[PDB]
Design a protein around this ligand. Sequence first.
Ligand code: 8OG
Ligand SMILES: OC[C@H]1O[C@@](CO)(O[C@H]2O[C@H](CO)[C@@H](O)[C@H](O)[C@H]2O)[C@@H](O)[C@@H]1O
Ligand code: NA
Length: 127
Amino acid sequence: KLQIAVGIIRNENNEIFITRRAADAHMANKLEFPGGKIEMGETPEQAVVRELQEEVGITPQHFSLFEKLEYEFPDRHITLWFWLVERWEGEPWGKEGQPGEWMSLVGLNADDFPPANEPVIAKLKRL
Ligand SMILES: Nc1nc2c([nH]c(=O)n2[C@H]2C[C@H](O)[C@@H](COP(=O)(O)O)O2)c(=O)[nH]1
Ligand SMILES: OC[C@H]1O[C@@](CO)(O[C@H]2O[C@H](CO)[C@@H](O)[C@H](O)[C@H]2O)[C@@H](O)[C@@H]1O
Ligand code: NA
């Protein structure tokens, strides 16, 4: 059972900053919204801020919870907190050496992301 906070970073051109997971990680090689595990003593709002600062070097500001869902993977159960981030300080980049780039929302392919993201990718194509 893991609680994961991730940020959907959208610019004014309806593009999202997406990174790719390592070949040796769970959901290897999949595209993803930057994020990570919510630690003990930390709230989901604080988690997404810390995770984005760590992973892509930006500080999320005035964000909202776009979606919260639970997904059962073959060996783990995770609760995902998808935060819509439209304002932030900094310029997103591959701060941890991971691949990262802007992707048009209309071009996103749910099959490229973990299956847990399916409903979120779909909903995004409408916001
Ligand atoms: N960062 C991130 N993790 C995701 C997404 N979708 C999704 O199922 N996950 C899963 C993959 C991992 O099992 C877990 C994240 O944990 P790690 O920080 O250890 O990789 O959440 C997503 O969009 N972003
Ligand atoms: O839960 C997010 C939701 O709460 C509001 C206030 O109604 O925003 C507050 O919480 C955000 C997340 O911590 C902050 O970024 C924001 O600055 C704060 O006002 C809504 O705007 C948002 O949908
Ligand atoms: Na982490």
